[PDB]
Short mmCIF file of C-alpha atoms in Angstrom, two decimals:
data_model
loop_
_atom_site.label_atom_id
_atom_site.label_comp_id
_atom_site.label_asym_id
_atom_site.label_seq_id
_atom_site.Cartn_x
_atom_site.Cartn_y
_atom_site.Cartn_z
CA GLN A 142 182.03 3.86 173.51
CA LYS A 143 178.80 5.36 171.77
CA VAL A 144 177.87 8.92 170.36
CA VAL A 145 175.19 10.43 172.43
CA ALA A 146 175.08 13.50 170.71
CA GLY A 147 172.81 16.84 171.68
CA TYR A 148 172.39 19.95 169.16
CA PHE A 149 172.34 23.48 171.41
CA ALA A 150 170.43 25.92 169.44
CA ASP A 151 171.74 29.24 169.89
CA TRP A 152 168.68 31.06 170.16
CA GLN A 153 166.42 29.37 172.85
CA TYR A 154 168.20 31.22 176.17
CA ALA A 155 166.09 33.98 175.04
CA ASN A 156 162.76 32.55 175.90
CA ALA A 157 161.98 33.81 179.41
CA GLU A 158 159.70 30.83 179.81
CA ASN A 159 163.02 28.01 179.35
CA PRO A 160 165.98 30.69 179.13
CA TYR A 161 168.35 27.55 178.63
CA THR A 162 172.33 28.37 178.51
CA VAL A 163 175.15 26.40 178.09
CA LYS A 164 175.59 25.49 181.55
CA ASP A 165 172.12 23.75 181.38
CA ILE A 166 173.70 21.23 179.13
CA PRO A 167 174.43 17.72 181.11
CA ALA A 168 177.90 17.62 179.37
CA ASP A 169 178.70 14.75 181.73
CA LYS A 170 176.23 12.45 180.18
CA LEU A 171 176.68 13.90 176.21
CA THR A 172 179.70 12.78 173.98
CA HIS A 173 178.89 15.63 171.81
CA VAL A 174 177.55 19.14 171.67
CA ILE A 175 176.54 20.77 168.22
CA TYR A 176 176.39 24.25 168.20
CA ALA A 177 173.29 25.21 165.96
CA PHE A 178 174.08 27.60 163.58
CA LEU A 179 176.69 29.13 161.93
CA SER A 180 176.72 29.92 158.07
CA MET A 181 178.39 31.53 155.23
CA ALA A 182 178.35 34.93 153.31
CA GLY A 183 175.76 34.03 150.72
CA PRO A 184 172.15 34.46 149.88
CA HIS A 185 169.57 34.05 152.49
CA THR A 186 166.39 35.29 150.64
CA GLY A 187 164.48 32.43 152.18
CA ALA A 188 165.22 33.24 156.05
CA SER A 189 163.96 36.13 157.98
CA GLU A 190 164.60 39.53 157.67
CA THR A 191 166.71 39.38 160.76
CA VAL A 192 168.87 36.82 159.57
CA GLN A 193 169.23 38.16 156.49
CA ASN A 194 170.49 41.65 158.22
CA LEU A 195 172.62 39.43 160.55
CA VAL A 196 174.03 37.95 157.39
CA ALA A 197 174.43 41.42 155.79
CA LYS A 198 176.70 42.88 158.45
CA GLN A 199 178.82 39.80 158.65
CA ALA A 200 179.44 39.16 155.15
CA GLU A 201 180.65 42.83 154.98
CA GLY A 202 184.39 43.06 153.88
CA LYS A 203 184.59 39.38 153.32
CA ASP A 204 185.01 36.99 150.65
CA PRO A 205 181.96 35.66 149.08
CA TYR A 206 181.11 32.17 151.21
CA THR A 207 183.47 32.96 153.88
CA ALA A 208 182.31 30.78 156.78
CA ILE A 209 180.58 33.30 159.53
CA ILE A 210 178.95 33.27 162.93
CA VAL A 211 175.27 34.66 162.46
CA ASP A 212 173.99 35.41 165.77
CA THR A 213 177.05 36.84 167.31
CA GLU A 214 175.27 38.67 170.01
CA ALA A 215 174.47 35.02 171.21
CA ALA A 216 177.86 33.54 170.50
CA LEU A 217 180.02 36.18 171.34
CA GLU A 218 178.60 39.34 173.16
CA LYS A 219 175.64 38.22 175.66
CA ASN A 220 177.20 37.77 179.23
CA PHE A 221 176.18 34.31 180.27
CA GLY A 222 178.49 34.64 183.47
CA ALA A 223 182.55 34.72 184.38
CA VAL A 224 184.18 31.88 183.23
CA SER A 225 188.05 30.59 184.07
CA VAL A 226 189.23 30.02 180.65
CA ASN A 227 191.18 33.05 179.13
CA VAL A 228 189.30 34.30 176.08
CA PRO A 229 188.45 38.07 174.72
CA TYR A 230 184.70 36.82 174.45
CA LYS A 231 181.66 36.06 176.13
CA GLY A 232 178.46 34.54 174.97
CA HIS A 233 177.68 30.99 174.34
CA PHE A 234 181.27 30.68 173.13
CA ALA A 235 183.07 31.67 176.21
CA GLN A 236 180.57 29.21 177.85
CA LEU A 237 181.61 26.26 175.65
CA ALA A 238 185.29 27.02 176.20
CA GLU A 239 184.70 26.67 180.04
CA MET A 240 182.48 23.72 179.53
CA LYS A 241 185.21 22.42 177.62
CA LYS A 242 188.05 22.76 180.02
CA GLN A 243 185.64 21.16 182.60
CA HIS A 244 184.99 18.25 180.45
CA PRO A 245 187.84 17.33 178.42
CA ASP A 246 187.05 14.14 176.64
CA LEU A 247 183.99 15.92 175.49
CA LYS A 248 183.57 17.25 171.47
CA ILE A 249 182.07 20.46 170.54
CA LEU A 250 180.99 21.00 166.68
CA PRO A 251 179.69 24.07 165.05
CA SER A 252 176.92 23.12 162.71
CA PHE A 253 176.79 25.28 159.41
CA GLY A 254 173.51 25.30 157.78
CA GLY A 255 170.06 24.12 158.87
CA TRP A 256 166.78 24.32 157.26
CA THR A 257 166.50 28.12 156.84
CA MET A 258 170.44 28.61 156.08
CA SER A 259 170.94 25.69 153.62
CA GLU A 260 170.31 28.21 150.78
CA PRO A 261 174.04 29.46 150.43
CA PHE A 262 175.10 26.13 150.02
CA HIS A 263 173.49 26.02 146.64
CA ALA A 264 175.35 28.91 145.42
CA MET A 265 178.58 27.79 146.83
CA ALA A 266 178.18 24.47 145.38
CA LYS A 267 178.37 25.92 141.64
CA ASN A 268 181.98 27.33 142.31
CA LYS A 269 185.04 25.37 142.85
CA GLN A 270 186.77 28.63 144.67
CA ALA A 271 183.73 29.37 146.71
CA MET A 272 183.88 26.09 148.14
CA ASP A 273 187.34 26.60 148.56
CA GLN A 274 186.93 29.59 150.43
CA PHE A 275 184.06 28.25 152.84
CA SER A 276 186.49 25.56 153.80
CA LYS A 277 189.38 27.10 154.83
CA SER A 278 187.53 29.81 156.47
CA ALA A 279 185.46 27.04 158.45
CA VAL A 280 188.47 25.69 159.52
CA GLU A 281 190.18 29.09 160.50
CA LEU A 282 187.06 29.70 162.19
CA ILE A 283 187.30 26.84 164.64
CA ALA A 284 191.20 27.28 164.81
CA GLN A 285 190.46 30.72 166.53
CA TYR A 286 187.51 29.25 168.75
CA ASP A 287 189.78 26.18 169.74
CA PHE A 288 187.14 24.54 172.08
CA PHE A 289 185.58 23.29 168.74
CA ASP A 290 186.87 19.47 167.60
CA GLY A 291 185.84 19.87 163.97
CA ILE A 292 183.00 20.81 161.43
CA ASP A 293 179.31 19.72 161.38
CA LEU A 294 177.33 20.08 157.99
CA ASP A 295 173.59 20.45 157.80
CA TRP A 296 173.28 21.27 154.12
CA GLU A 297 169.53 20.80 153.52
CA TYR A 298 169.89 19.60 151.01
CA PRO A 299 172.36 18.46 147.99
CA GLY A 300 169.62 17.64 145.36
CA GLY A 301 167.01 19.83 146.74
CA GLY A 302 163.89 19.13 148.96
CA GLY A 303 165.07 22.34 151.29
CA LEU A 304 163.20 25.40 152.11
CA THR A 305 164.07 27.05 148.89
CA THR A 306 164.53 24.15 146.75
CA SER A 307 161.51 22.15 146.49
CA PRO A 308 161.02 20.00 143.64
CA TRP A 309 157.63 20.12 143.43
CA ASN A 310 157.16 23.71 142.47
CA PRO A 311 158.35 24.40 138.81
CA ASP A 312 159.99 27.75 140.29
CA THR A 313 162.40 26.15 142.69
CA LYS A 314 162.81 22.47 141.44
CA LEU A 315 166.50 21.74 140.86
CA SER A 316 167.27 20.73 137.18
CA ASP A 317 168.86 17.07 136.73
CA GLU A 318 171.74 18.82 135.81
CA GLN A 319 171.85 21.06 138.73
CA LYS A 320 171.01 17.88 140.97
CA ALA A 321 173.98 15.86 139.50
CA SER A 322 176.37 18.96 139.78
CA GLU A 323 175.43 19.15 143.69
CA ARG A 324 175.89 15.72 144.34
CA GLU A 325 179.36 15.82 142.64
CA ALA A 326 179.71 19.19 144.88
CA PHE A 327 179.22 17.52 148.24
CA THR A 328 181.84 14.85 148.12
CA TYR A 329 184.38 17.79 146.73
CA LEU A 330 183.07 19.97 149.74
CA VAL A 331 183.93 16.96 152.60
CA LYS A 332 187.37 15.83 150.54
CA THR A 333 188.38 19.66 150.80
CA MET A 334 187.27 20.34 154.31
CA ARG A 335 188.62 16.89 155.52
CA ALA A 336 192.07 17.90 154.12
CA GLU A 337 191.83 21.21 155.19
CA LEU A 338 191.13 19.83 159.01
CA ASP A 339 193.97 17.68 158.43
CA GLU A 340 196.13 20.23 157.99
CA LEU A 341 195.07 22.21 161.17
CA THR A 342 195.84 18.73 162.43
CA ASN A 343 199.41 18.99 161.18
CA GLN A 344 199.95 22.38 162.91
CA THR A 345 197.73 21.67 166.37
CA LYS A 346 198.58 18.05 166.89
CA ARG A 347 194.69 17.59 167.77
CA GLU A 348 192.00 15.47 165.92
CA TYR A 349 189.27 16.86 164.35
CA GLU A 350 185.77 15.54 162.98
CA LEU A 351 184.05 16.26 160.01
CA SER A 352 180.45 15.27 160.16
CA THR A 353 177.08 15.77 158.39
CA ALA A 354 173.74 15.83 159.13
CA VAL A 355 171.68 13.17 156.73
CA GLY A 356 167.84 13.80 155.98
CA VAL A 357 165.77 10.62 154.98
CA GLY A 358 164.18 8.96 151.83
CA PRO A 359 165.17 11.04 148.83
CA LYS A 360 166.99 13.44 150.81
CA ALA A 361 169.66 10.78 151.49
CA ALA A 362 170.18 9.81 148.03
CA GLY A 363 171.15 13.24 146.83
CA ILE A 364 174.72 12.35 148.33
CA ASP A 365 177.30 9.96 146.98
CA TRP A 366 177.66 8.04 150.02
CA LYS A 367 180.30 5.45 148.59
CA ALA A 368 182.66 8.65 147.49
CA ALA A 369 182.00 10.82 150.28
CA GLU A 370 181.86 8.35 153.25
CA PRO A 371 185.61 7.87 153.96
CA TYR A 372 186.02 11.79 154.54
CA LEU A 373 183.29 12.02 157.33
CA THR A 374 183.16 10.97 160.90
CA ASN A 375 179.73 10.69 161.70
CA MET A 376 176.36 10.96 159.73
CA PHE A 377 173.50 12.45 161.97
CA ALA A 378 170.47 10.59 160.24
CA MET A 379 167.38 13.43 160.87
CA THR A 380 164.91 10.85 161.49
CA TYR A 381 162.51 13.64 162.44
CA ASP A 382 160.28 15.58 160.98
CA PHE A 383 158.54 12.39 158.72
CA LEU A 384 154.93 14.48 159.53
CA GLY A 385 154.34 17.65 160.62
CA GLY A 386 151.72 20.69 160.53
CA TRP A 387 152.96 21.80 156.94
CA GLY A 388 150.68 19.10 155.76
CA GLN A 389 147.45 17.32 156.48
CA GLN A 390 148.86 13.99 156.95
CA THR A 391 148.53 13.40 160.29
CA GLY A 392 150.73 10.27 162.52
CA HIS A 393 154.05 10.16 163.86
CA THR A 394 156.87 12.65 163.12
CA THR A 395 159.83 10.41 164.20
CA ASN A 396 158.64 6.50 164.84
CA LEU A 397 161.10 4.07 165.33
CA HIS A 398 159.19 1.46 163.47
CA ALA A 399 157.52 1.43 160.25
CA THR A 400 154.23 -0.16 160.11
CA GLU A 401 151.52 -0.98 158.00
CA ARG A 402 149.80 2.15 159.42
CA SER A 403 152.90 4.45 158.88
CA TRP A 404 152.32 7.09 156.07
CA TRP A 405 154.24 5.95 153.27
CA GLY A 406 155.87 2.93 155.27
CA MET A 407 157.84 5.50 156.68
CA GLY A 408 159.86 5.09 159.97
CA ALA A 409 163.20 5.42 161.52
CA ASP A 410 164.40 1.77 160.96
CA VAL A 411 163.57 1.53 157.33
CA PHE A 412 165.38 5.21 156.64
CA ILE A 413 168.67 4.05 158.43
CA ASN A 414 168.55 0.82 156.41
CA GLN A 415 168.25 2.55 153.27
CA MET A 416 171.25 4.80 154.33
CA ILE A 417 172.99 1.48 155.02
CA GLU A 418 172.34 0.58 151.73
CA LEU A 419 173.43 3.35 150.10
CA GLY A 420 176.92 2.68 151.40
CA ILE A 421 176.99 4.77 154.80
CA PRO A 422 178.27 2.40 157.41
CA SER A 423 176.56 1.67 160.32
CA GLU A 424 179.05 2.36 163.25
CA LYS A 425 179.25 6.00 161.54
CA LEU A 426 175.36 6.67 161.63
CA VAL A 427 173.71 8.44 164.79
CA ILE A 428 169.68 7.92 164.97
CA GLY A 429 167.61 10.94 165.71
CA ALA A 430 165.72 11.50 168.73
CA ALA A 431 163.39 14.67 169.10
CA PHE A 432 162.96 16.53 172.66
CA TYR A 433 160.03 18.18 170.35
CA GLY A 434 156.63 17.20 168.97
CA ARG A 435 154.37 18.56 166.16
CA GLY A 436 150.58 18.80 166.27
CA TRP A 437 147.30 19.39 164.14
CA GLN A 438 143.91 20.48 164.80
CA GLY A 439 141.05 19.18 163.35
CA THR A 440 142.01 15.60 162.96
CA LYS A 441 139.29 13.74 161.30
CA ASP A 442 137.48 10.42 161.55
CA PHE A 443 139.74 9.46 164.71
CA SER A 444 139.02 8.90 168.29
CA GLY A 445 142.46 8.29 169.71
CA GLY A 446 142.81 4.62 168.45
CA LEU A 447 146.47 3.67 166.52
CA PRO A 448 147.04 6.05 164.07
CA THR A 449 146.67 4.70 160.48
CA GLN A 450 148.22 5.35 157.10
CA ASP A 451 145.59 7.22 155.76
CA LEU A 452 144.57 9.88 159.18
CA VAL A 453 144.56 13.51 158.04
CA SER A 454 143.84 16.85 159.47
CA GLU A 455 142.15 20.15 158.36
CA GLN A 456 145.56 21.66 159.11
CA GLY A 457 148.47 21.97 161.42
CA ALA A 458 147.81 23.24 164.94
CA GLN A 459 147.80 27.02 165.20
CA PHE A 460 149.38 27.31 168.45
CA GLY A 461 153.05 25.97 169.97
CA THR A 462 155.89 26.81 172.10
CA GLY A 463 156.78 30.03 170.21
CA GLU A 464 155.75 28.55 166.70
CA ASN A 465 152.59 27.17 165.94
CA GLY A 466 152.78 23.78 165.20
CA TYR A 467 155.93 23.07 167.08
CA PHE A 468 155.96 22.08 170.70
CA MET A 469 159.19 21.23 172.91
CA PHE A 470 158.77 18.14 175.39
CA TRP A 471 158.67 20.43 178.45
CA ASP A 472 155.68 22.44 177.36
CA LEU A 473 153.71 19.00 176.62
CA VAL A 474 154.66 18.02 179.94
CA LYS A 475 153.74 21.07 181.71
CA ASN A 476 150.57 22.18 179.79
CA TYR A 477 149.44 19.32 177.70
CA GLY A 478 148.40 16.78 180.42
CA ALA A 479 145.00 14.80 181.03
CA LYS A 480 143.62 17.79 183.12
CA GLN A 481 144.11 19.58 179.84
CA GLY A 482 142.12 17.69 177.73
CA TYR A 483 145.18 15.45 176.34
CA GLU A 484 145.26 11.71 176.43
CA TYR A 485 148.64 10.29 176.64
CA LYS A 486 148.98 7.22 174.12
CA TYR A 487 151.57 5.44 172.92
CA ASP A 488 152.01 2.95 169.81
CA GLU A 489 153.82 0.12 170.99
CA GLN A 490 154.25 -1.59 167.42
CA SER A 491 156.05 1.81 166.03
CA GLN A 492 157.38 2.65 169.52
CA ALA A 493 156.00 5.96 169.65
CA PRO A 494 154.01 8.30 172.18
CA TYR A 495 151.03 10.83 170.95
CA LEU A 496 148.74 12.66 172.50
CA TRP A 497 144.75 12.98 171.27
CA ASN A 498 142.34 16.14 172.59
CA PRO A 499 138.87 14.45 171.69
CA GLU A 500 137.22 17.89 172.33
CA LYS A 501 139.60 19.85 170.73
CA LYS A 502 140.70 17.43 168.05
CA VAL A 503 144.20 17.65 168.35
CA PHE A 504 146.59 15.26 167.68
CA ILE A 505 150.34 15.86 168.75
CA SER A 506 153.15 13.32 168.20
CA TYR A 507 156.22 13.40 170.29
CA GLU A 508 158.93 11.62 171.76
CA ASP A 509 159.66 10.55 175.15
CA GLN A 510 161.71 8.38 177.61
CA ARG A 511 159.62 5.04 176.12
CA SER A 512 160.58 6.19 172.84
CA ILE A 513 164.27 7.35 173.08
CA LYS A 514 164.92 3.84 175.33
CA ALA A 515 163.47 1.93 172.00
CA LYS A 516 165.72 3.95 169.76
CA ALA A 517 168.97 3.57 171.52
CA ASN A 518 168.29 -0.26 171.93
CA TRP A 519 167.81 -0.33 168.26
CA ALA A 520 170.89 1.93 167.65
CA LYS A 521 172.91 -1.15 169.85
CA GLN A 522 171.06 -3.74 167.98
CA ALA A 523 172.05 -2.35 164.64
CA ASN A 524 175.64 -1.62 165.47
CA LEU A 525 175.00 2.09 164.82
CA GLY A 526 177.39 4.55 166.04
CA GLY A 527 175.22 6.22 168.60
CA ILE A 528 172.08 8.74 169.16
CA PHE A 529 171.48 12.20 168.89
CA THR A 530 168.90 14.81 169.70
CA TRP A 531 167.50 17.64 168.20
CA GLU A 532 167.50 19.65 170.59
CA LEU A 533 168.29 19.66 174.39
CA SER A 534 166.57 22.90 175.37
CA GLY A 535 163.30 20.75 175.09
CA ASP A 536 164.50 18.66 178.27
CA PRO A 537 165.76 21.40 180.69
CA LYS A 538 165.81 18.95 183.53
CA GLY A 539 168.00 16.32 181.37
CA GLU A 540 165.61 13.40 181.92
CA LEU A 541 165.72 12.29 178.42
CA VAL A 542 169.35 12.67 178.06
CA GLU A 543 169.69 10.63 181.19
CA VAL A 544 167.60 7.85 179.11
CA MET A 545 169.70 8.32 176.18
CA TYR A 546 173.09 7.98 178.17
CA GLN A 547 171.87 4.98 180.11
CA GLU A 548 170.66 2.99 177.22
CA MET A 549 172.96 3.74 174.46
CA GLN A 550 175.88 3.47 176.69
CA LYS A 551 174.28 0.13 178.32
#
């Protein structure tokens, strides 16, 4: 029985072009739904003003580093439709409670953190009591919202390399002291959360999962996997965002196979193998697939052949699906076809599709049925735990979910 997991972004329903809700989830084809994102009462100076305000409102009258719902409008308030379960809230959470009733073998996890809300973890990790407050309160939160089956951590990342912790800027770079501190803090955190969840099981007789997202390359080395892995159920390997419009280096964002034409030798396979070498058991690792793409404009010295290890562009694409340089799968399918000047290409060696617009010199790296099938078969061959996607709304018709399910469970 393999993991087939989908992240559900809490904000996507509000896009009138693809107003994706819990009711749109192909729950019969998934083993896990991961709700993104919750946080804690701590600093979010690096996030939008909107998130900072929401956090501040939720933080009021709570102890520092209490686990919180951030977008409570989405989670609890918005009426997405009547349900059969007897819960006093609406929002996505009522829909999730209904979904759990209708699909009782499905696991539903909240995810804490993500790119823009990882910042507070760094403050939290400086104090044992802060970690203990987060752990206790996160489990209290799922105890209240009892359709959840555990907790997913998305701290990007212990040892830095995240939004507010770039190592290449002296202003944000973590000291070596801070990196060692955070390495030990992550082990403590998962040990403490696992014991808290164990206490919940003493009370409810239900099993709960504790899982984490895992960054690639140096982003995985910041955790002591040999010490931490016993406490963790699954490791969601973020084998995407290898490249994107934040940099000029152009190519595959989520290619299965590293090749000689990979920028810096990158590929999912090499990164998953590295994770195994660091001590994550293969059967716990879940390979990451994308229902999005990333793109560039002003791609240089390229005419639609195979991408190479030195391929650059003037800049990230100054357009996207609701944010520049970021494209949802559905948008690519509907609006970036041959008739719009974009030629479909497939790098068979890398197992990755890409679009090339010769007239606009636009290169888009993405993921499709072919590459997802390749990833799922590779996952089976590598004795991995399964496959996951960021994120479900990219595939409104559930066509890519169908491939994950069919290929991962065959």
